[PDB]
Amino acid sequence: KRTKKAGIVGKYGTRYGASLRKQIKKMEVSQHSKYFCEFCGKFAVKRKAVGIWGCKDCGKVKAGGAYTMNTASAVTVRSTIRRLREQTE
Amino acid sequence: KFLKPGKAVILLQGRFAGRKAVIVRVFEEGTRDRPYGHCLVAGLAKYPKKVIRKDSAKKTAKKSRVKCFLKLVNFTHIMPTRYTLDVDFKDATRDKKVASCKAAKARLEERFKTGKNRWFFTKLRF
Amino acid sequence: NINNKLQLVMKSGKYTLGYKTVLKTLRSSKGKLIILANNCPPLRKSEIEYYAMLAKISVHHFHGNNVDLGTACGKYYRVCCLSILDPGDSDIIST
Amino acid sequence: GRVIRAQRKGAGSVFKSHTHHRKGPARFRSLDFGERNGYLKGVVTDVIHDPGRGAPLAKVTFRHPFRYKHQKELFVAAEGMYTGQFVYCGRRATLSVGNVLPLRSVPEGGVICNVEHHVGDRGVFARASGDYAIVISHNPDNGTSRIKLPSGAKKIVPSSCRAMIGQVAGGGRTEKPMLKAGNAYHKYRVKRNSWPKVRGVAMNPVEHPHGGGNHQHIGHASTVRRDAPPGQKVGLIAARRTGRL
Amino acid sequence: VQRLTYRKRHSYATKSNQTRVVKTPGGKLVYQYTKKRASGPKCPVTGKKIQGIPHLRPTEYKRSRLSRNRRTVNRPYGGVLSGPAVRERIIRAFLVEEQKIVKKVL
Amino acid sequence: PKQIHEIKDFLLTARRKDARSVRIKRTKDAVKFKVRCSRYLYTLCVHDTDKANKLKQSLPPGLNVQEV
Amino acid sequence: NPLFEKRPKQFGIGGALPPKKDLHRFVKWPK
RNA sequence: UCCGACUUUGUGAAUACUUAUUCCGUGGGUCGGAAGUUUUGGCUCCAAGGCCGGCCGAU
RNA sequence: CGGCCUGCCAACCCUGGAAACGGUUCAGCCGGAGGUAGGGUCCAGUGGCCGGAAGAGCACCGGGUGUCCGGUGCGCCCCCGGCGGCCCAUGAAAAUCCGGAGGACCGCCGUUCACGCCCGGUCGUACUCAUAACCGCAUCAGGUCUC
RNA sequence: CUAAGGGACGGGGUAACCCCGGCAGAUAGCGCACGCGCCCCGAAAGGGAAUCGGGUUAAGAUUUCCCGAGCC
């Protein structure tokens, strides 16, 4: 409805090229999404600025990715740091 | 079962927030005026001050003084501790209330001089 | 096997859900067991364990989230803590 | 001719950095006895935005080691840090993301950021958003450590140098297309007077070595000696190769 | 319709030059200069408003200009921390202190 | 300016040393007694005709009295 | 007197604030 | 601007040293040798105590 | 300007314990981390009444009369409140003022209370602000920041 | 009062005029002997002690004079 494929990117009209609009689409969606708060258990985490993710209700503010709360390498880094910490013992 | 007369509590709200008190009477079910469970407590409005050997005799007598308050507190405004202070209290007007406060002050000042219950007279830091 | 036993307590026993009613049952010593979610606020968690130590009530730390609790109890809202006051035909207490 | 634009930036007149709304230098706390021998706990109070910096900064409060005072710090925030979190700095700090450790305490393969080059530098390496260094190896004889920098270069650092555990927050920032001259205008408005660049071929010969001609063309090789004087050193400087491989 | 003029030599509509229209007993309209809207006291741990204190310009809170009951709240950390913040600190102070004793025994 | 409600408090204020004059203003409803003190002008409204007269006669003899 | 008691302070890295020490050898003297 | 000589420029072993020089850090706040605090977004200062102004507590 | 009342929209408190889920905005959104409901606290106003103050001002009649009662709104201007959106943009500082933690020290001495007494320097201030008071050699169809 | 910024003690450079402010130099002092110790200029649109109504001149006062009423 209202659009067959543009979605959030229809605000850009006919400008900038179809491939660039398709490129920006995933980050426009992800940066405006609501994320799960591990501290309180609600989907209330919103981007306050690039890298800054604040929960609406519990008030926790977390440092994360530019356009998504958790980057892929952040999970990988945490697992590497956790394995190094345990094997250190 | 741990909210009984003689048990020590901490007030969490109000004018005496953060003060230590002892339970005197428990209305577990609550009266008609107060449907909720509540207790009568006797607390320290002014803690006895730090008493040290270097002090003179008159000064350490002034530092050992306490002030006592009487208050009815909702159960939800109380942090129940594991400590116990028994001084045989067994307890309306603005004259009866203040007189009863002075009696508890004499008993609590005497307990403090005994040296026991050091936690009860040593304030809380927050 | 704790999700099934908790599922049976909601079907036949008596319980209460939520912080304020968990504290009330501890004050009146009606709860037989306290269950805490793993993301329950650390100040809140400490106070409930201290209340349970004042009485003689056991506390179990639920293996999952506060979203997972409540779902285990078959409700569509989150549950931070649970208090069991009657299991009836459930062996949750003896474990 | 006249002084070219590349030369005029060193005077720093209109080319000074825009820093009026910046929150202060981001760096470790000064190295002291407690960090050198044990650990010190601070609490994260805010995660804030710094204009011109992609990565968020973390406000941390410590207790002063010997004065009855608060000690407030501000460094680059590692990804995953949050407000109300306890961070620990020092030799005996646990290997956890957000903690500040000497490199001697980080095993091989650890991901680190804001790495000191000299002991007490307060952090020199891997500070931009999404960047990190990797611990490669340890030398106990010389007391040095080998780390891998974001550019790929290996570097030898003293094992007493401090680094934070984790990678810098805000990664993925440059994958998003800017799409607009105006978005680029706002980016550089809070950084420097550099954004709208005029091509040297679009100039007159008085202003640029590339200027002039009846067609826009350089007219000589754009690769230039490393030792060329300022005003002459434009184009690709000391290039070992050109073109797209 | 009785258009108005500024009454001082400030000629620019800045936030410090905000006016209101009043009717005088002389039957005319004049400008009166108002005070900028001010936040009241705020709690540093919750960010919420501090109950019991009015929202004034900082110099209107001066002791010679404001009564003492209006300036304060009768509780520890009265005008600084809210009630929820004070309750949490009392509970945290006591519960962590008990843990220190338990660490010592164990 | 401040209002006084009970008659006796107006009596003590008119007896103050810093009180200078009393103005009596007649309205179609009541009678206003205004005593000019150092900082404030105090007004008392008397809705009764005889109470106004009793107040008039009982004023301190040292204070000036004016009819408005 | 039972009121008198010891109140020791443990001077660790993150312990009680230390008392005044000599600090003479670490003084930054005039040029 | 690169490059060489002299000067700054010293000492000792068959390359080492540190005090010149250079760089970095700190409110110059635990350096050298020996002897013998992970806790929950809370508070932490101006010593209690012991023994003769003095010493330990605080090698 | 002072006193009393009122108490928006948010925020907070106490009781209680919600699925047959409910409450709710133009939009949102909110609730076992405690909703709906019931009862309260605070907040701001350029809100109401009284004092100021009808003695003033205004309009009439020759000293006198009057200065009263309602209704309405996607109306216009200013201010405030509370939501939503946006940023690889996150949008001053300091003086100044208030509050708080602690409790060394102190008794006929403390008092941020009311009322009472005295004092308040220097310089600017007229007028124009424009198709004639400014610049454009001018009393120039130009140019010159605002309510 | 501070903003962007400007000047400037010591020190450094410079034949001198003059050019350099973070390069740290016993920082030139503050409370009650004892204790502590990390320059100025720059906004009549930024921040900011405290005023209102009515009257008055040929010419002032869009809050300065008069009347009354307040405030700092």
Ligand SMILES: [K+]
């Ligand atoms: K030239």
Ligand SMILES: [K+]
């Ligand atoms: K430009």
Ligand SMILES: [K+]
């Ligand atoms: K270009």
Ligand SMILES: [K+]
């Ligand atoms: K050319």
Ligand SMILES: [K+]
């Ligand atoms: K108040």
Ligand SMILES: [K+]
């Ligand atoms: K004038």
Ligand SMILES: [K+]
């Ligand atoms: K003209």
Ligand SMILES: [K+]
């Ligand atoms: K000004």
Ligand SMILES: [Mg+2]
């Ligand atoms: Mg051309």
Ligand SMILES: [Mg+2]
């Ligand atoms: Mg040329």
Ligand SMILES: [Mg+2]
């Ligand atoms: Mg209600």
Ligand SMILES: [Mg+2]
């Ligand atoms: Mg009136």
Ligand SMILES: [Mg+2]
């Ligand atoms: Mg009239």
Ligand SMILES: [Mg+2]
């Ligand atoms: Mg307009």
Ligand SMILES: [Mg+2]
């Ligand atoms: Mg106090």
Ligand SMILES: [Mg+2]
């Ligand atoms: Mg100044």
